[PDB]
Design a protein around this ligand. Structure first.
Ligand code: ZN
Ligand code: ZN
Lengths: 257, 67, 115, 148
């Protein structure tokens, strides 16, 4: 009735991808960790946009939606920041938001590409993943775009703009031993990247005593958070949800008894 | 209209890869090779640039309301 | 025009209790837990952890409606073992597993970087 | 006690007509001693069965076999009565038909016991002497272990 002792083996570690294997844990635990990668990892993104001038061929909400999807480097100050709901200040403050300024006007005949590089943050650390550049809008001569934007702290449950990761690869039981999927013709299915069987055989022999374990992960960051920090933040957030639920359950038990 | 950020399915940044894709197509590369050069592996990401039609370039042929 | 706010899936509004404990009168030593603003991420993990307990006779969770944000976890245990105790033990178990996993993952990251 | 039928069976066929189900095969068996025909559906991927292998099939009203009803409810924590765990494959079902060879005046000399184990059906044909413990709509435990 006690906790399994999971182990981690990290195979690939880049600035964009972390490929790791978690052993000796439940399938539900692994899937919840995967869901938190997408849903419950806090990340800073633009949520409040106010436009002073927009002469571009894209309307105001178009460019606002494009701005909100621009990832911002939230590696360390995301934990320091507080949700605007939990912040004591009205509107926005530096302890709950990062302000952005955009001012682009096309004066030359050549087309003007408004990029994330033209986003200017009041913080030196929260940068739109520009150490190419994400295109915001193209400006013909005589077209102008000036706006102010505030970046809030949020997670992917509220909006996909706060999804810190690209496609999270998840896999368990590479050679089909638990038969959680049944192949009508196993011979015509490509072998997994983590398959451990020979070319001659298609799937592993059925294991009645087996259970899902050794879950293969490949979390691809979108640049807002380092891909290793995504897993750390996910584990911390899942543990925080469990701890809050435990506190409220303890209060409920004491009150009802 | 314009190259979308954040590929619909997975969420990879593809808004910074349209001009590079156009250049790779213009110089040597085929579309499949150009997509690989940009690191667009998942076909959800590949269809973002492969099926993109850049109408904003046609929209820039119209004079602005204010000179 | 009837779009619910996007924060309505995790934010508790005024007067909404996070967890409600109600006994199940059909079976002895059985309880029903209603978690508000919670989804499969916590429900599935709690159900899986409760099944590891030999003293838990029944452990299941469900979302009654996807458009609503609520979890019902039904826990039945052996005599002289309250389902609330099993729930608390499962949560502590999950926290202990997550802490160990986080420590080991940090050690693995340190080993991979320059090592 | 609480044991309704016990015999050593030998598998004669696995799928005489065809493999109707991937995980379920139909064992056509004949017993020594009592000389009784057996048709049984057995989960194969869980309990593989080959052709011409002996197994001891025991049909009992209760696993405890000391004379207490099982009440038909699942409880993993019932090790206390020391149930019959001497078998590799244990099934739990209900007999739904007892067909016979009786004809008006004369009594039935051969009986057929039809049992559904959650959907895996069993027919046990033989002389009425050893099948008289079966009653329709009664819970039955199937206990089979392979023999060397
Ligand atoms: Zn504030
Ligand atoms: Zn994609």
């Amino acid at each position: 009735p006690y906790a399994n002792q999971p182990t981690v083996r990290i195979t690939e570690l880049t600035d964009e991808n972390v490929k790791f294997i978690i052993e000796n844990t439940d399938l539900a635990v692994a899937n919840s960790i995967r869901r938190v990668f997408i849903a419950e990892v806090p990340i800073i993104a633009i949520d409040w946009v106010q436009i002073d001038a927009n002469s571009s061929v894209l309307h105001d909400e178009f460019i606002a939606h494009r701005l909100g999807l621009i990832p911002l480097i939230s590696d360390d100050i995301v934990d320091k920041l507080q949700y605007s709901r939990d912040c004591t200040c009205e509107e926005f403050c530096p302890e709950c938001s990062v302000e952005f300024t955009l001012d682009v006007r096309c004066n030359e005949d050549q087309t003007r590409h408004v990029t994330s590089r033209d986003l200017i943050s009041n913080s030196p650390r929260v940068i739109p993943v520009t150490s190419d550049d994400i295109l915001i809008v193209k400006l013909r001569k005589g077209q102008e775009l000036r706006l102010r934007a505030y970046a809030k702290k949020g997670f992917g449950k509220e909006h996909a703009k706060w999804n810190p990761t690209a496609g999270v690869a998840f896999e368990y039981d590479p050679d089909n031993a638990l038969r959680h999927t049944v192949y009508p013709k196993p011979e015509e299915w490509p072998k997994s990247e983590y398959s451990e069987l020979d070319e001659d055989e298609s799937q592993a022999p059925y294991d009645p005593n087996g259970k899902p374990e050794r879950f293969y992960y490949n979390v691809e960051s979108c640049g807002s958070l380092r891909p290793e920090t995504i897993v750390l933040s996910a584990l911390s957030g899942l543990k925080k949800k469990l701890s809050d639920l435990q506190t409220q359950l303890s209060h409920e038990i004491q009150s009802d008894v | 209209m314009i190259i979308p950020v954040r590929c619909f399915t997975c969420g990879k940044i593809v808004g910074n890869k349209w001009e590079a894709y156009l250049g790779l197509l213009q110089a040597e590369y085929t579309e499949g090779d150009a997509l690989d050069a940009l690191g667009l592996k998942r076909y959800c990401c590949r269809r973002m640039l492969l099926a993109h039609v850049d109408l904003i370039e046609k929209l820039l042929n119209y004079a602005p309301l204010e000179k | 025009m009837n779009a619910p706010p996007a924060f309505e899936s995790f934010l508790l509004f005024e007067g909404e209790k996070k967890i409600t404990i109600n006994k199940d009168t059909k079976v002895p030593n059985a309880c029903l837990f209603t978690i508000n603003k919670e989804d499969h991420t916590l429900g599935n993990i709690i159900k899986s952890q409760l099944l590891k307990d030999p003293q838990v006779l029944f452990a299941g969770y469900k979302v009654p409606h996807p458009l609503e944000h609520k979890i019902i976890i039904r826990v039945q245990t052996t005599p002289d073992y309250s389902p609330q105790e099993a729930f608390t033990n499962a949560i502590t178990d999950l926290i202990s597993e997550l802490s160990l996993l986080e420590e080991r993952f940090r050690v693995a990251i340190k080993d991979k970087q320059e090592g | 006690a609480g044991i309704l039928f016990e015999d050593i069976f030998d598998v004669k066929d696995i799928d005489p007509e065809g493999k109707k189900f991937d995980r379920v095969s139909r064992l056509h068996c004949e017993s020594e001693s009592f000389k009784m025909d057996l048709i049984l559906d057995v989960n194969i991927q869980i309990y593989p069965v080959d052709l011409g292998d002996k197994f001891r099939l025991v049909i009992a009203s209760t696993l405890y076999e000391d004379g207490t009803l099982d009440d038909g409810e699942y409880n993993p924590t019932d090790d206390r009565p020391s149930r019959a765990d001497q078998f590799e494959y244990v099934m739990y079902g209900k007999v739904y038909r007892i067909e016979g060879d009786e004809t008006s005046t004369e009594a039935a000399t051969r009986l057929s016991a039809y049992v559904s184990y959650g959907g895996l059906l069993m027919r046990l044909q033989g002389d009425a002497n050893n099948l008289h413990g079966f009653e329709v709509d009664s819970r039955v435990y199937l206990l089979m272990k392979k023999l060397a």
